[PDB]
Amino acid sequence: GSSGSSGTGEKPFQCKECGMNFSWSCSLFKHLRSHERTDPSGPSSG
């Protein structure tokens, strides 16, 4: 299976719609709207 982690990169904030991560806090919100206005057309992320 997927066995290979090249480099390390974690994130404090994360999207609860698609999983998109964002360094800042507010930033995420600016992206979250993408779901508040338009629908992803179903569960994009498991």
Binding site for Zn ion (CB under 5 A): 15, 17-18, 20
Considering the complex, what minimum distance in angstroms separates the CB of residue 6 from Zn ion? 24
CB atoms inside a 10 Å sphere around CB 11: 11
Shortest distance in whole angstroms from residue 23 CB to Zn ion:
15
Which of 25, 22, 27 is CA-nearest to residue 11? 22
- CA end-to-end span of the chain: 18
Q: How far is the CB of 3 from Zn ion (least distance, A)?
A: 27
Residue 10 vs 36, nearer CB to Zn ion: 36
